[PDB]
């Protein structure tokens, strides 16, 4: 049971991170919403109750994550679980001949920084915090869960930067599990397909709906609560480690 | 919730299948233990109560599986879930030059027959049973879960036939999910690493210690109840489909 | 160079196997076309010249493959390369509610037997033949190259049996390579996407053209000589072992 | 044949990149060695003759890459092939309880920037130069070949940053292929295992020999010429696209 656990959730003010916070808190765990100052994390934490607090932070900054982790320790005593949900998307072709347009370097760099470097920043710092926990009866001190994407495996036209960042997450999952194995911290990754969150609000309704119609079964966007459910499953199951799990209705993305 | 669901579980007399039955019955589901007549399936079904019965069957035989499925309908009225745990193992090198010895054809055929064909036989016949169910609120008529193995991905020396059979289960996981998507039957696969079923627990203690010593974290054989927990998670999560999940404590098998 | 090498090519009377034989014989190697009696191997062996012969054989049969290998030794002195191209296709849904149709067991079995068991039968027997070769300066005694398919990874609707058989080939690639590594026999697998061979002729022209239109680049079916080129590249490169190579114009198959 | 093609080879002053240049120039191609100013690339270009020149540049830099590509256009008129070999390595645990030590953020950022962003930097700019070529008979305008690592798949203890960078390479291979498919530019990636290059010089001789000893077959480090051979095979085969190829003697890395 997740009752009593302390979880730090990046991107916790919105979409999949928020849904995760809701479910876990609803089960008696405590949540720390690590999100940008501009988000509505403060209001979300206020709605989720006394077992939920907001820690304003940018995941690409060492100092910010240190501050939020210190806050989490200070309020809830320890960190049992970390969920990397902070992330951003861009659509931009590598090169467009007809338009004579080139993907910009900084668009590639900014996506890499938040999604990949930002996730690793939280991982390396939170691992030091989980290192201080006494191992439970099973030898465990903590659980770390990251968010990749099926774009790591079937990136679509326009998805080079996103794919690189999420492929980086997939690739570093096993080595980081190996690193932390002697101190009993599990490391797992979820690769969502298409989910109904504000991430997708930026696209034409005909665009979303089309995408939606491609999921083999069930034929719809995933529900953020379904992501949350898989997070809990992973937290609960002591033998799940070093793996990436597709959560995507069996879709395979076309160009 | 799996309360009230009806599950047909092959290899239900022992190890992973048995663990799955115990947990699902313990959670309010009904279970049919599908296994060979000479096994202890009857006793395990008796032990598990009125919501559990034993159906003798060889999964390589169409008639037997038809017989078992007819028994399940007659006893519990419908089938909501199928879990393929029935399997065998062999250790035999492709060729041994020092011994002058060749893997026998029928050793290869037998393992294929039980592990791969047998699983497909249950899937195709149980899909036809599930197609008679009225779709639930989610439009779902059924969930089928197969058992592969990490040997699908890192088959060891001696494991050519087993690896072949488990790779086949992995390979057909998506197309079967695609096939049955229009009727709302999700198809998922679990790839166990090293688990404490009679297959391993009946080995010499030094060997058990050695095998456990290979799992990065936690450094022990998997508990069959952990497989069962994962079966339940997949049953409960409506968006898991067409995927293979490694359940293995982050091990990667060496030759 | 492949110059002077002896290759036994199963499925050599047609399509990819035939083109492999054409290229290799063209590159100074000798080829044995291993294929069924009713195939046109005899005529194809005559067309290719003195350095190519036909060995009639069914790859699911121990004695036949034994007879064909003995033919190959007696005629060309040794065996240095084996390429498994013998294979069959079927299109059949696991279950079709609207049509009231269930995949037959014997369609699943026949596909397994020829494609998967047949390939392992050739592998296990030819390995013992290569093990009698004295290793070259690089320690190598033989190269074995198998044919899987992208259906091992993206099985389409109707391809469950095919995908099972090819996923099998993929899964046993590494263990067999591990098995034979002490005696210097490399094991590699090619996964072709879509190629213009007599295999696809049964299909309606419209489907063939539609499939062709979906290969991203180059936008066409693969030419069998392109497969042949990859086989030579694998033969020639000493460090390629235990791997599966997609040859498919970047396509990813949809349902 | 590669005779007459113009290839831009990053990391061309050393190891795999150098060996690639050696082989292609030897086969009649022209090469531009793109490498750092303090590398001995000039000396290597001078040694390779009229058909090889050096372009001093840091792949993390837009201006430097623009300069080296313009240098290429001016010396050989066009660019037909790009090979990304530029790369660095670091060994550093995510978190080390024993030493109470944490992976630095900048160690992670540096490896990403050189290995992953730098590779994307070259690809996006060179795609612009190949776009200018009239398509050949097969509609092809160019070939892009990247260097990942088996660390993308089995990152070792200490390899998190490196694994992240090469996993990124693997991830973006398909989307970039799909991006450039309508203009006829193929994108391919090689994942080398262990190769005898200066990359490995800074390791203790013991680690090196132990690493070499775990290659199943052939049991040695890979020869840089063997990388070069594979590059050539990919350039030559028109139907290889959107794929990653392991070149590693069938090794699988342990923690
Ligand atoms: N939803 C999905 O379907 C999927 C999500 N994910 C990931 O899940 C995590 C949570 O995201 P979220 O909750 O959905 O978004 P959110 O914005 O509501 O919340 C994120 C939070 O992070 C917080 N945050 C942010 N930065 C920081 C920071 N620095 N520090 C701390 N906190 C930070 C932020 O404030 C916010 O609260 C992130 O890692 C996502 O990348 C992966 C696969 C799926 N997934 C589907 C995706 C699609 S369809 N695209 C398309 C696409 O690729 N197209 C081209 C090809 C064809 C498809 C159509 C377009 C797209 C969509 C919109 C815009 C551009 C591009 C992209 N990525 C996708 N991911
Ligand atoms: N061509 C391709 O695109 C592909 C081929 N391959 C494989 O390559 C090998 C050689 O095949 P071939 O040379 O193309 O055929 P061939 O008939 O010319 O040569 C075979 C030889 O083997 C010999 N032989 C045979 N048996 C033996 C034996 N016992 N012993 C000894 N020798 C034997 C036989 O006599 C003959 O000489 C085989 O192992 C194939 O499986 C894999 C990927 C591709 N590949 C593409 C494929 C497609 S599109 N399908 C579709 C499909 O799946 N559909 C569903 C999804 C939507 C798309 C439309 C249909 C299909 C096609 C035809 C009928 C049903 C279904 C199937 N398989 C495919 N494989
Ligand atoms: N060799 C191999 O086995 C492998 C190589 N590769 C890649 O192949 C490409 C060519 O590299 P190279 O020719 O081998 O090196 P090089 O130095 O001779 O040439 C690189 C050139 O790029 C140039 N260059 C550079 N930067 C730039 C730039 N900015 N702009 C422009 N040009 C640049 C540079 O000047 C130089 O000329 C690079 O992209 C490599 O990353 C992948 C898998 C293999 N591969 C094996 C690897 C191993 S065993 N490690 C271990 C490890 O991970 N350990 C932990 C786990 C346990 C095992 C023991 C240690 C390691 C080794 C050394 C130091 C630290 C760590 C790392 N990476 C590996 N990659
Ligand atoms: N335990 C591990 O280390 C491990 C690792 C990977 C995969 N697996 C797989 O997990 C699944 C369950 O294994 P287990 O550990 O529970 O093994 P087990 O031997 O404890 O149980 C196997 C069950 O399958 C039954 N069975 C065998 N042939 C049958 C047939 N022809 N028809 C019907 N029933 C048949 C056996 O009688 C037995 O009850 C198998 O597919 C196995 O290959 C196990």
Can you describe this structure?
- It is classed as oxidoreductase.
- Keywords: protein-inhibitor complex, rossmann fold, oxidoreductase.
- The assembly is tetrameric.
- Crystal Structure of ABAD/HSD10 with a Bound Inhibitor.
- Chains A, B, C, D are 3-hydroxyacyl-CoA dehydrogenase type II.
- 4 copies of one chain form a homotetramer.
- The first copy, chain A, has 255 residues and is of the alpha/beta class.
- Chain A has one domain (1-255): Rossmann fold, CATH 3.40.50.
- In chain A, 42% of the residues lie in helices and 16% in strands.
- The first copy, chain A, is built from 8 helices and 9 strands.
- The first copy, chain A, has helices at residues 15-26, 41-48, 62-76, 105-130, 151-154, 160-180, 205-213, 224-236, and strands at 6-10, 30-35, 52-56, 81-84, 95-96, 101-102, 142-147, 185-192, 244-247.
- In chain A, strands 3-2-1-4-7-8-9 form a 7-stranded parallel β-sheet, sandwiched between helices. Chain A has a two-stranded antiparallel sheet with strand order 5-6.
- In chain A, helix 1 crosses helix 8 and helix 3 runs parallel beside helix 4.
- The longest helix of chain A is centred in the middle third of the chain and has 26 residues, at 105-130.
- The first copy, chain A, starts with 5 loop residues before the first strand and ends in an 8-residue tail after the last strand.
- At the A-D interface, helix 4, helix 5 and helix 6 of A face helix 4, helix 5 and helix 6 of D.
- Bound molecules: ligand TDT (3 copies) and nicotinamide-adenine-dinucleotide (NAD).
